[PDB]
Design a protein around this ligand. Structure first.
Ligand code: 5GP
Ligand code: ZN
Length: 338
């Protein structure tokens, strides 16, 4: 829909390597096949036929990482993701990515993130502020649930060093059937005690103890919340933690059986803060405009209700007050139009 495409939007939950253009992923595959590193037909088959249920999508991510883990590619896809979000009028983007180590190519977590910064410096089609369309970009560093406590601490230390190029917080993500909260809690507590903002993937699978322990940590945001129970909802509503809602992702991974029963409607009606997000618009073949369209249809929102929802996301960002004031100005300058 045209007016949804033109709506200024805020993206808080987008994984870099889950946001790659189809043609770019297949071009990387083709180039690596011409070098003999992979069998192009096999990789292409996985990309087309992986059903992207919660179990299968992490195998897909292993394949994506075999295609994308080198400095030049990280720079390229960072630029492409930012340009794609800006062209659908995302005015503020928190981009999250897991820094990667790869000794065989001389990649450290730090040099991975430097390739991300290089990608932001190469953005040309739009105006960008990371510390004619204009987009504010800020960065979240992801801890993957496969990692050790010490490796998670390395990521937190890097985030603290990189506050000067717009890192604002830390994410916990990766396969929810892997790893234990006790592994990551000490590193996340260090991050929080050093004033980094914290967002947690929470309740993607049934796990009552882990959900309660993540809620008691009091992160600044959580993502998904698909298998919360009533005591979980009560605690979340009392702590006022915003929820990153990923409609398409949830339906495809089979974490929520349909949009008509999705908890985002309850949160909306309970006046609990929620933000519509893409999660992985490349993996799940969507866009932030389409997520808004699904939500507007399902809830039956008017233009002005949709605009109020979009604007409310400003106070869930991890950005400094000056940036929030600028976002308020932008949204107000798009306010009386509709
Ligand atoms: N738990 C979880 N992690 C995800 C999801 N989508 C992307 N990720 C994380 O994001 C990574 C891909 O983006 P990256 O951090 O490599 O840029 C995946 O390997 C995974 O750890 C998701 O739906 N659930
Ligand atoms: Zn996610």
């Amino acid at each position: 829909m045209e007016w949804i495409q033109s709506l200024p939007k805020i993206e808080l939950h987008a994984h870099l390597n889950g946001s790659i253009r189809d043609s770019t992923l297949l071009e990387l595959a083709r180039v690596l096949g011409e070098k003999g590193v992979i069998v192009f037909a096999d990789v292409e088959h996985v990309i087309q036929k992986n059903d992207r249920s919660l179990v299968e999508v992490f195998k897909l991510f292993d394949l994506i990482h075999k295609l994308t883990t080198d400095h030049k590619t990280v720079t390229r896809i960072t630029r492409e993701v930012v340009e794609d979000f800006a062209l659908e009028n995302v005015v503020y983007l928190e981009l999250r990515t897991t820094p990667k180590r790869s000794d065989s190519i001389g990649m450290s977590k730090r040099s991975y993130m430097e390739a991300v910064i290089q990608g932001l410096r190469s953005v040309s089609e739009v105006d960008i502020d990371f510390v004619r369309k204009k987009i504010y970009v800020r960065l979240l560093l992801s801890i993957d649930r496969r990692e050790t406590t010490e490796s998670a601490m390395e990521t937190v230390k890097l985030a603290l060093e990189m506050r000067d190029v717009g890192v604002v917080g830390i994410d916990l993500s990766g396969n929810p059937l892997v790893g234990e909260w006790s592994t990551f809690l000490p590193a996340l507590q260090y991050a929080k005690d050093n004033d980094l903002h914290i967002t947690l993937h929470c309740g993607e699978v049934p796990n009552p103890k882990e959900i309660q322990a993540m809620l008691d940590f009091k992160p600044h945001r959580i993502g998904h919340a698909c298998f919360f129970k009533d005591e979980d909802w009560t605690k979340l509503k009392s702590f006022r933690i915003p929820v990153e809602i990923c409609l398409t992702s949830n339906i495809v991974t089979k974490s929520i059986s349909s949009i008509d029963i999705h908890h985002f409607a309850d949160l909306y009606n309970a006046k609990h803060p929620l933000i519509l997000c893409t999660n992985d618009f490349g993996v799940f073949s969507t866009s932030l405009s389409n997520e808004y369209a699904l939500a507007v249809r399902s809830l039956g929102l008017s233009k002005s209700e949709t605009f109020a929802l979009a604007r409310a996301a400003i106070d869930a960002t991890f950005a400094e007050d000056e940036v929030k004031q600028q976002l308020r100005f932008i949204f107000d300058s798009a306010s009386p139009e509709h």
